[PDB]
């Protein structure tokens with residue numbers, strides 16, 4: 001099935017998911033000189049104080065931390081959004097080398113990794129319905145650069161040994177996602193899609209301007225995960241990013257001048 005290899009990677013996805021060649025695909029390159037400052041955009045409101053994390057799992061494409069989304073406990077509002085979006089999960093994309101790994105780029109610059117916090121619009125009642133709507137999901141994207149360690153990420157890094165291979169999961173309670181946010185919440189926003197199959201065009205992207213720093217030791221631990229299941233030939237989980245797609249008839253807006 002689909003993946004990130006020579007024979008099943010992003011250049012092949014359109015054969016099973018024709019919307020890969022659609023009009024609002026992600027990720028995109030953010031051209032900072034062509035983005036438009038929009039003073040009508042509100043500040044983001046991130047309310048994560050009551051977040052309840054549940055599990056961490058290797059899904060064969062990335063690793064994911066899942067949250068209890070059965071009530072409004074961890075929500076995103078404001079910015080370009082109408083209504084309330086509940087945090088469902090976060091995951092990362094990363095590279096084999098420090099100079100690649102992010103999905104979005106900024107003036108063609110690639111970061112070492114990209115963190116996606118995935119939220120769904122509560123008016124649609126469940127995430128399955130939300131993915132069928134043009135305003136169903138909001139994904140907060142945060143770039144990672146290599147430098148100083150991020151203390152709030154260490155709890156994640158320390159459990160990765162226990163989910164090395166596809167299909168492994170572990171209890172992961174009491175994790176506070178506020179520890180992954182940068183100082184500033186200034187952002188770019190544009191209408192886009194999931195960056196993995198099914199590539200649904202249901203996402204309002206909110207990409208933060210300020211990267212977080214993580215240490216080389218932290219990102220090295222990501223690169224030791226496996227795409228394969230236990231008992232299969234080892235293939236390291238690296239370069240699980242989709243390249244930038246055509247902007248087409250979209251404008252990227254910025255919350256800041």
Ligand SMILES: CCN[C@H]1CN(CCCOC)S(=O)(=O)c2sc(S(N)(=O)=O)cc21
Nearest residue numbers: 061116118127128131139193194195196
């Ligand atoms: C390996 C599958 N990853 C998909 C899963 N989901 C898709 C199915 C939900 O249907 C019920 S998801 O909405 O949690 C989401 S968000 C992104 S991204 N990279 O942020 O655009 C990928 C995904």
Ligand SMILES: [Zn+2]
Nearest residue numbers: 091093116195
């Ligand atoms: Zn993602």
